[model samples]
Target chain A: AFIGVDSAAGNVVKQFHAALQMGNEAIVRQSLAANVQIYEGGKVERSLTEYANHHMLADMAYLKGLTITPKEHQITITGDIAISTSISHAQGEYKSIDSMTMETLVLIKQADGRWKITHVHWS
Target chain B: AFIGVDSAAGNVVKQFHAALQMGNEAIVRQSLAANVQIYEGGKVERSLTEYANHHMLADMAYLKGLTITPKEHQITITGDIAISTSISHAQGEYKGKSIDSMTMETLVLIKQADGRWKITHVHWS
Candidate 1:
């Protein structure tokens, strides 16, 4: 039996973006913890439910036409918690304008033996 | 013996900012974990040493004249780890210009053996 490695945590981060890119709401919801905290544009959403009810769709719409490329990615794991910092260069047109942004995420190992995003900060 | 409480984590986050405002490098250093991660302005500092060597002083300088008022704060603690989210409104004059901005912070904390909390991660924008 093999154990989970550090890169396994990074995979969860990647899976999250894949879900977003694929526009799968159920996968997105599955990737997040119940009490997830999201910080964007100086506003905070305290839970996955709050996010789904609010900016999740707007965010999905914004990223609909964008191609996000990862310039740098670093992940640090301490016990059951991990934090990933990435400088993603997203390029494309959205709402008739070109845009780009970076992202940060924090995840925790859930009781179900899977990593789930607990916090996110995007700018 | 009184065990460390959840609010202790919030206090550590506050103390970090207070240290910056007062220009107390030692206090700031003491409040942070050695492997702390700091994210600001689309950049990441991987350790306390990295932050000290780079933008820590500049950050202090930037906040020197800004009066930051907390508009909202929420904290969640799980086992020995805690995360805090705060939205602050800063208004003051800097570099001879009036500036007002809404700032957001995400602070992750870990409890030490001495019943003290130390910031392990910080994201600011």
Candidate 2:
């Protein structure tokens, strides 16, 4: 059979971007755990609070026109921890940046029973 | 220290690439689990056996000069599972194609009863 993704992963990605689009910190925080690792271009942000503090507003503005299309995702579950990898593209534009972004998102299941955006690698 | 990676992931990435450079399937297979889920570029290969059959040889040939410089590695661990996300690059060329590839690799680890972190899922862009 061909490859596909787990429903939980798809749901998480959906909520993640939706939170960003809505620009709601409380909503966004639900999808991001503490000590989240974000990698964009080559810079790494150590925590979600750190990222949301400086880049969240700007990112929210940028993500306004963004839509993700997952080319592939693979989820691995071992006990309570689950890691889902997504190869996808963020399309559309914001703030004169009308280019599609190739992205790799790694989502992790939190200890408190929530899926969070633990890592994001994007070009 | 913001967030540091465990020694295991570092060594695994090193040896995994080294095994590829050496074209040693035995060593390569040792690092991978039987039911490995490998995501490369945009495709997912469900098993190491499946990946080895189709893309392994070509990958070895392509990785002639693959050098991975991990700029960032964030590891999260819980119980028997570990996941390391690396923002890095693969440099060098093969088959007349000079290349420097920007890559994001997510490696999933599982600690067995005997205490070995087998590579169960390898997702790379």
Candidate 3:
């Protein structure tokens, strides 16, 4: 069945994709609030600065591939974010880029009337 | 050296701990944006509804013994949120609960001018 695929969800994912492609920490940071928690590979990254200081952004850029396209997205938002997207990558020289589909679940919070990212557990 | 440890970060962790303890889906959902992506055990879950429908919340409540406390939080914010919290748990009847320290990293996003909780990646090693 079709889930809640509204404009808000679409826009957020769009920005996420954009931020990743551009490698713009500013925009990426803009997407988060003052108190955000990111967990990667089971390690807890305290804040944006820590996240930036860590190897998430850089690693994402490298792993996502330069020519990354997001497709087959199923977004639902009743209170938090849970999205499944199929990523298609163009052929790259490094490892002969292969297409891989990934599903991500994002949790957003409303602080001071604005929407911000709080907890994200992706696999 | 101590990093950016402020009130804002404390509050966020408090809320997070609360949501898990109470199992309040609404509060948990309220803390998220319309477009949230949650990944666990190598599977990506796409929204609040999907997350709720999935076994995350329940599993969290079940696996996570009650009386959980947050400690040793190192937080920083340039444009987004990056927080690390250490959680303390109480003993349970079933298994002799030990104070297991867990580290959680959260990434929050701001949408519509308000700060909301976003992506999270956690590891309990």
Candidate 4:
């Protein structure tokens, strides 16, 4: 129900979040580029394998437990590269702790005619 | 003491932070490109003027309140564009709170027509 842009790359962003909400690892795996850079909490993960092995599972569980709604989105496409900045409002109980967080995701597109997320700065 | 890149565009990233750390408004204004994009705390400022009128003063105050030491820096350049990622360790008292924080900044720079690099985008988390 959270719609971003009406473009192909934006669909990928939607699918990425949808996968996270559903805890679908396969879709999440396929959506991330090989050389993905994830920046979160003052740390950076230089590759998909690094994130997949580290925080991917925990993220899936956390997203699964929250009801996240999209508040605003700004998508910029420069040739094959697309930068999508979205602010999502997340509220729910995770581990019996009621919390609300303003989630921001910056998704960059890849060159293979597919919009694989190259970098994510989640805060 | 915090060294990023030795090239032209890389120097812009350093100047941007140096201006902030010193609260030099003129240098900070001159270092940003006309169409700068700043992303932080789940919000985005799409232009230099918007940010200048908004959070620029607050950021200067916050930076001045703490002693920010550089931890790590990574710079990647492609043609006229450069991306600099860095982690800085911040400690000291700000607003009566004994705060110790690790700050991450991602800066994107572009070579301008005047043969100088200017900041186009900054993601601070």
Candidate 5:
């Protein structure tokens, strides 16, 4: 019988995984706060609606075709994030068809009884 | 003659700059709430104290020697950040050195009565 914000955190992470795997905009939107923001690919920052419109949703769909095995995940709720996760995938729209590994930082937030994506600063 | 939390935001940014430029640990600690976290260098996360100890302060000191010109800065009060800045610097511990460029993402927050910026994600070509 979980109670309070701890349960909410779990739900947020779960929704995030579902959205990332399926590119389900409805689910993604459900998880985000009304004023959620996301930053990706160095410094390309966008709001939830803007991010969904700017091919991020489509990119996730494209990524679905690629097998991405997550290496690690760490989450801490101390105002900010400093953790890394590695994923293995095949190259996209490139001559060299090979697998590669990339790491990314996932920042999350909880607002108004829901969890939202604040930023994803990836290298 | 200001009212409300607007003044607090200025204080937070000011404290952040002062702590960063002077490596003033005490002032830095004062600005942060009891539980402040920082993430840097592509997912390397740490607490405020751990970050201060783990060569970041020293690195700032070293960077002081190199003239860093900020190319751009943008801030938003939303829950997330998606902004960039570029800086010029001379390479350290390398011969035939010349000015090099780097870019980074600076994330910020407004907590309680103060605003704090954390997580300096950086990259180079």
Candidate 6:
């Protein structure tokens, strides 16, 4: 928890992941920038709407039964814009494929004081 | 290339000349991470501490009488890692000659566990 810089912002980022984990579209919708950029599987999805329509359910399904642990969490606050990153590890089975994934999620704060899920980099 | 994201790491980029405005390299040096990497023109300077010791004095002299203002500034942080960019102009002279320079500056930073943002990479063009 990066309380020294932003406590609520950190919570918002966590809630973002939890929303993803639960496949809760309502929270996901509320937590993204109008135009979010998502990068995963060596490709870029230009916006949140595209992600929600094209990839969200598949991503959620892939994440099912996997235990996720995010470490190296960090956040930077600069006026209306704040960004946070955390390395996440998910290990389990999805679509009968046993797998593990390590990726970084970058969250940006929106103008309305709400933190939005922005870019994601996978490694 | 992504201009500043407003992180202090971004602040570091715009304020580098502020250090110059105050007449010292200490402020500039404080922004660096211990394991900094810098690329200048066609050459590479390994570990900024080393560059500061052997080359910075000369570089500082190169900016003598010059004032820099950034045209584009940005910052982005991923966990402990950060990146900042500065592109701008500066005017100065040596020995009664007037000159102007266009600077393309990109700085990379990583926040230590202790919460200090240390610049670890600098590439100049």
* TM-score of the first chain alone, every candidate: 0.88, 0.72, 0.67, 0.84, 0.62, 0.80
Model 4, C-alpha of A41: deviation from truth (Å): 1.5
C-alpha TM-scores of all predictions: 0.83, 0.73, 0.43, 0.83, 0.54, 0.50
- Between candidates 4 and 5, the lDDT winner: 4
Candidates' C-alpha lDDT: 0.80, 0.69, 0.50, 0.75, 0.46, 0.62
Q: Report the C-alpha lDDT of model 3 over A1-123, residue by residue, as the tens digit.
A: 224444565566667657866777777677665555655444555566777665556655675555665544555454544332333334453436554434343535354444455544333
- The better-scoring model by lDDT among 1 and 3 is 1
Best by lDDT: 1
Badly placed stretches (over 4 Å) of model 5 are: A1-6, A65-123, B1-6, B32-36, B43-45, B65-125
The order of the candidates by lDDT, greatest first, is: 1, 4, 2, 6, 3, 5
Off by over 4 Å in 3: A1-6, A60-65, A79-95, A99-101, B1-125
Candidate with top DockQ is: 1
Better of 1 and 2 by DockQ: 1
Error of 1 at A73 (Å): 2.4
- DockQ for model 5 equals 0.14
Candidate 5 lDDT, tens digit per residue, A12-79? 65566667668777887766544444443334544677766765666677667665554334443443
Clashing pairs in 5: A82-B45
Q: For residues A1-123, what per-residue lDDT tens digits would candidate 4 score against the true structure?
A: 234487887888888888878988889999888878777887778788998886999898887767887766766555555656666677777765433333334344455577788767777
In Å, residue A98's CA in model 6 sits off its true spot by 7.8
Please identify model 1 stretches exceeding 4 Å from their true place. A1-8, A96-100, B1-6, B112-116
Real A-B contacts recovered, model 3: 0.20
Model 1: number of clashes? 0
lDDT tens digits by residue: candidate 6, B67-94: 7756655566666667564556777786
Tens-place lDDT digits, model 1, residues A1-123: 112324767888877888888777888898899988888987778789999886888888877888887767777677788767677667788654434465668888987779999889887
Q: Supply candidate 4's per-residue lDDT for A77.
A: 58
DockQ of every candidate structure: 0.47, 0.31, 0.12, 0.39, 0.14, 0.02
